[PDB]
Amino acid sequence: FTVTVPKDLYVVEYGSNMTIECKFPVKQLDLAALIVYWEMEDKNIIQFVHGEEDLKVQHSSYRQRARLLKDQLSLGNAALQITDVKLQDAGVYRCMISYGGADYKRITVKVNAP
Amino acid sequence: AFTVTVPKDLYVVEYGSNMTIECKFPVEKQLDLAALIVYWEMEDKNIIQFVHGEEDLKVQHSSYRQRARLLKDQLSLGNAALQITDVKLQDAGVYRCMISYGGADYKRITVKVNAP
Ligand SMILES: COc1cc(-c2cccc(-c3ccc4c(c3)OCCO4)c2Cl)ccc1CNCCNS(C)(=O)=O
């Protein structure tokens, strides 16, 4: 099992939305076996465990601002959507995916002002 | 839900001593090696990649060849214990143990080495 980032650097305009993608291999999807986790500066962004997001562990600064696009998991794409990106959202994100095997990658986000 | 725990997230060790750094994880009955992944890392360097019962030495960073062990007799007790023989200063740093056994979780451990 291997997780891939076709793009490991993203340049997003401030105040944009951003969707950063980690690809993992896809038969039909076994939601009960899949765990997708995203993180940045060791803050819990997304904890997608067997079927859905657990928001009791998501960090304050990401409540109602971060989303894993559920309709894209079927395509073997863990896609993290951060709305209204701020300068602080620049940094190094980590998708960790558990789905049979287990792997992780790094994506770097740089945020321009206008 | 599934959580990895770390009784000690700071290890102060002597130059050239041995160190064993632990991440505990829950186990009910018999340990099911096929369901279990344990991975250890420091500074983006692969140390241990114990997946489905067998260590992978192809992926293991050269600086840990012959130097690093995942203690299999501890796994059964829900304890993932990375053993590093003859620690040098190059071993100080932040270690992550990432564990997949049913759920998934990871923890950090900081390793400080006093000098020779
Ligand atoms: C289930 O939540 C996580 C899930 C993973 C996760 C997700 C996907 C893959 C992996 C993983 C595991 C082993 C690996 C690996 C990746 O890549 C390399 C090979 O070894 C891992 Cl760790 C990490 C952190 C978390 C945060 N848990 C907060 C805890 N407390 S609570 C109250 O929420 O329960």
Numbering used by the authors:
A (entry chain D): 19 to 44, 46 to 133
B (entry chain C): 18 to 133
Quote the study that presented this structure, word for word:
We were able to crystalize and solve the structure of the 8g compound in complex with PD-L1 at the resolution of 2.3 Å that allowed us to decipher the molecular basis of the interactions between them. The asymmetric unit of the hPD-L1/8g complex contains six protein molecules organized into three dimers, with one inhibitor located at the center of the interface of each dimer. 8g is mostly buried in the deep and elongated tunnel, which is composed of two PD-L1 monomers. The 1,4-benzodioxane group creates the standard interaction with ATyr56 (the monomer molecules are annotated by subscripts A and B according to their chain arrangement in the crystal structure of the dimer), previously observed by us for the BMS-202, BMS-1001, and BMS-1166 compounds. The central terphenyl moiety is stabilized by plenty of hydrophobic contacts with BTyr56, AMet115, BMet115, AAla121, and BAla121. The chlorine substituent attached to this moiety forms an additional halogen bond with the backbone carbonyl of AAsp122, providing the rationale for the enhanced inhibitory effect of these halogenated inhibitors at the R1 position. The methoxy substituent at the meta position of the distal ring of the terphenyl is also additionally stabilized by hydrophobic interaction with BIle54 and BVal68, pointing out the importance of this substituent. At the other side of the tunnel, the sulfonamide polar extension forms a hydrogen bond with the carbonyl of the AAsp122 side chain and is largely water-exposed. Our structural data confirm that the terphenyl compounds with the rigidified biphenyl unit bind to PD-L1 at the interaction site that has been seen in the compounds with the biphenyl scaffold. The introduced phenyl ring replaces the benzyl linker of BMS-1166 and thus provides the rigidification of the structures in the conformation that fits perfectly into the PD-L1 cleft.
